[PDB]
Design a protein around this ligand. Structure first.
Ligand SMILES: Cc1cc(NCc2cccc(CN3C[C@H](O)[C@@H](O)[C@H](O)[C@H]3CO)n2)cc(-c2ccc[nH]2)c1
Ligand SMILES: Cc1cc(NCc2cccc(CN3C[C@H](O)[C@@H](O)[C@H](O)[C@H]3CO)n2)cc(-c2ccc[nH]2)c1
Length: 765
């Protein structure tokens, strides 16, 4: 039955707009298959269109905003794009239709509407780009009855082992198509829908904009060798309308040109299913998809006071939709240094110098290919998977569709190598590599990342103790399925546990350190003088200089999170010997946290080093790090140490801002210094952790109930309002919020862990 619930998920999820890197495109969860992408641009001039054309997501003064208003990966949704440069408000309605044995059929409505500043008669080029990768597959454009283009529909007929037979229809569409007077309309026609059919070697079909512009150049060079001159040049649009050449290939460019408002549909009909898909199908399924989304939101995300008003429901739907609508499918080789050079051991003072020499041998090589099905931090800036980001992404996704979140966890853990390592940044394929500077491509098998995917497993387990809607909850509804999922994954979770203990180990034994355990001590590998990228808190102040004897309370707390989950998962599977060993490790962690990381002087936890004189020092930097035992849920509700930390959290002179908890105390000597990334600003992911724990230390008998209820109430309000205000004014979720102003700053479209607020608004954790 697990395979059956499993075969039903593959089929539900196969098709999607799973190319979050571009404004709108589709691909299935198959490495080498059929991909679509939308391009458009105003043409007012002979040279402008190369600058106005839109394909891959950016965020600059020329784009007001874009995002999904509703989305569910199983059904589809509606995307709005607000393009200032091109005077357009574009709508992408996308919807799926189950049927057949090939993950079904789908359709999309592209709707463009000039804004009030657009020339009422603006000319707008729209391209629909279709490519097919694969060895024994065919795609052909049926030619048109008309002489130099198509008057009505465009029919692509194709077949693959993976998809079998399908047809892809780009419709005539409503909207004024402009005609030309000029001599040139003897050879190209007056103006019509046109199709070019090409072949390139599979590995370049992703480079749609260069492929398009190679055909626009050819057809411009062709005017110049046919004596068409500056005396009487044709209109810019006609110069940039392609010569119809429909045929068979792995690339089909379908070009329309429109005067004023316009709209056309894409209907992909799977031959495995019955009747072909129609625009009447599109309108029915979209209306239906909207009611369903509406009903599911109101149940899954019941916004509690003071946020029950419609304005907050709207904001909630935006944050949630953009988070889940970022889901992408990624396929290709990764770049990995597999030397495991001895300098990566970092066992010498000045180890950062040694590790740079090793990197400077550039031994890294492409390996794979791999697949990842994951949400992303940001479409314009980070259209790829980040390991500890996804743990936060999936908390709200799991609530909506636990079966989807478990598909994504599975996808991530299938990347785990034999030693237990998952690269913290998944850059799969050339398409992914193009958005990434050459210096950040190389992954390093000693580089860890917080294991937040365990927190999603925690929520999965608590909901286990206690048709598309049937599928979404099947792995909790049918407990035999959940168990089987956890049984298959468990050995991976354990392999990663051991990988942290082998690769990220602190040195207790070799220094003058007294502790309750000689085993439990951790140090983040990968840190430079200013940075610790592997912890996720890029520039949070750590011991200076970096040193093999450093110990990292945030790493120790994450191991803690892992063990609590391994004990819980192990108990369910009956791993009785393993559970006994976990309970010993947990115990030792609780004690060593105190014996190595607690500052009675400063009333918080701290990273440790060893002195210029070879003895253990605590290095205390009041902020997110200082609270990690608490944030990760390891302190007992009556701990005197919890009491001391709650003080710190509520202390307006240290971490309490009107807009949320500051990354670093105002009182710390590194507050607002250097790139000031994790050195003052408000981060929603850590604020989320603080809030969840406060609600927990507030819903139990104990001495901090009342204190922790005030803090929960206020921190909940401050964070939600900060993110709502900014969403009202800018239309964006942001990576961080300014602690002096509550202004969103740095990365935009951060949905992303900023979308964590939707969960914060509904409460009941
Ligand atoms: C490629 C690049 C990076 C950076 N700065 C680093 C950077 C910025 C934004 C997001 C992140 C990723 N974040 C960082 C978070 O700290 C992680 O916790 C989290 O996992 C992760 C994913 O969300 N890194 C600056 C430039 C630049 C070019 C020109 C001027 N500047 C270019
Ligand atoms: C004030 C501020 C804004 C942003 N914005 C998002 C962002 C993210 C990553 C890379 C870039 C760089 N550039 C800027 C170029 O103009 C783009 O064309 C180009 O695509 C893009 C990506 O390379 N921007 C990030 C930071 C930041 C965080 C950490 C260190 N710095 C600070």
């Amino acid at each position: 039955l697990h395979s059956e619930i499993g075969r039903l998920n593959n089929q539900s999820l196969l098709w999607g707009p799973y190319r979050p890197n571009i404004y709108f495109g589709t691909r299935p969860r198959i490495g080498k298959s059929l991909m679509t992408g939308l391009m458009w641009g105003k043409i007012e001039s002979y040279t402008d269109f190369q600058h106005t054309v839109r394909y891959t997501c950016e965020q600059n003064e020329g784009m007001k905003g874009y995002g999904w208003d509703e989305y569910d990966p199983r059904r589809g949704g509606i995307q709005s794009i607000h393009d200032i440069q091109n005077g357009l408000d574009i709508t992408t309605s996308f919807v799926k239709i189950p049927g057949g044995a090939h993950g079904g059929s789908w359709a999309a409505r592209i709707k463009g509407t000039l804004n009030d500043d657009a020339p009422k008669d603006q000319k707008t080029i729209v391209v629909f780009y279709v490519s097919q990768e694969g060895e024994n597959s065919e795609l052909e454009a049926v030619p048109s009855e008309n002489e130099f283009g198509y008057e009505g529909d465009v029919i692509l007929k194709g077949r693959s082992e993976a998809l079998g037979n399908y047809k892809l229809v780009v419709t005539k569409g409503k909207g004024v198509i402009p005609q030309s007077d000029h001599d040139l309309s003897r050879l190209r026609g007056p103006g019509q829908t046109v199709v070019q059919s090409l072949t390139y070697p599979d590995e370049v079909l992703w480079q749609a904009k260069p492929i398009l512009f190679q055909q626009l150049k050819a057809g411009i060079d062709w005017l110049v060798e046919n004596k068409y001159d500056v005396a009487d040049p044709p209109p810019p649009w006609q110069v940039y309308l392609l010569a119809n050449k429909p045929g068979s290939g792995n690339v089909h460019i379908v070009q329309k040109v429109f005067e004023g408002d316009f709209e056309f549909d894409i209907l992909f009909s799977s031959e495995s299913a019955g009747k072909e898909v129609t625009s009447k199908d599109l309108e029915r399924e979209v209306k239906q998809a909207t009611e369903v989304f509406g009903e599911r939101f109101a149940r899954v995300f019941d916004l509690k006071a003071p946020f029950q008003g419609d304005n907050y429901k709207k904001f909630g739907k935006s944050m949630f939709s953009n988070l889940i609508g970022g889901i992408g499918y990624f396929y290709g080789h990764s770049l990995v240094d597999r030397s495991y050079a001895p300098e990566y051991d970092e066992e010498n003072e000045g180890f950062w110098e040694d590790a740079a020499e090793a990197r400077a041998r550039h031994q890294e090589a492409l390996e794979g290919p791999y697949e990842l099905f994951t949400s992303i931090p940001s479409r314009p800036f980070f259209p790829r998977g980040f390991l500890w980001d996804e743990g936060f992404h999936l908390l709200p996704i799991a609530d909506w569709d636990i079966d989807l979140a478990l598909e994504i966890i599975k996808s991530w853990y299938n990347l785990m190598d034999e030693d237990g390592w998952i690269a913290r940044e998944q850059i799969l394929g050339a398409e992914a590599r193009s958005k990434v500077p050459k210096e950040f491509q190389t992954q390093y098998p000693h580089y860890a990342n917080p294991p937040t995917l365990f927190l999603v497993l925690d929520n999965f387990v608590e909901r286990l103790r206690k048709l598309d809607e049937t599928l979404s909850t099947a792995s909790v509804d049918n407990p035999e399925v959940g168990l089987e999922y956890l049984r298959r994954l468990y050995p991976l979770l354990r392999r990663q546990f051991d990988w942290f203990r082998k690769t990220q180990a602190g040195d207790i034994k070799s220094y003058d350190r007294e502790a309750y355990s000689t085993k439990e001590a951790y140090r983040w590998r990968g840190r430079t003088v200013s940075h610790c990228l592997t912890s996720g808190l890029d520039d949070y102040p750590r011991p200076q200089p970096p040193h093999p004897g450093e110990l990292h309370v945030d790493l120790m707390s994450w191991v803690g999170v892992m063990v609590k989950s391994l004990i819980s998962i192990g108990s369910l599977l009956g791993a009785t010997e393993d559970v006994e060993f976990y309970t010993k490790v947990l115990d030792a962690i609780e004690h060593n946290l105190d014996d190595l990381h607690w500052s009675e002087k400063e009333g918080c936890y701290c990273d440790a080093t060893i002195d210029e004189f070879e003895e253990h020092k605590l290095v205390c930097h009041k902020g997110y790090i200082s609270l990690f035992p608490f944030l990760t849920g390891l302190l007992k509700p009556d701990s005197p140490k919890l009491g001391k930390l709650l003080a710190l959290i509520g202390d307006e002179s240290e971490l309490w801002s009107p807009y949320g908890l500051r990354s670093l105390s105002k009182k710390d000597e590194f507050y607002g210094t250097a790139e000031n990334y994790w050195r003052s600003p408000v981060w929603i992911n850590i604020n989320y952790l603080a809030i969840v724990q406060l609600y927990n230390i507030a819903t139990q008998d104990g001495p901090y109930k009342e204190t922790a209820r005030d803090l929960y109430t206020r921190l909940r309000k401050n964070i939600v309002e900060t993110v709502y205000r900014n969403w009202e004014e800018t239309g964006f979720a942001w990576e961080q919020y300014n602690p002096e102003t509550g202004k969103g700053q740095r990365t935009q479209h951060f949905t992303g862990w900023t979308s964590l607020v939707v969960k914060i608004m509904s409460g009941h954790h």
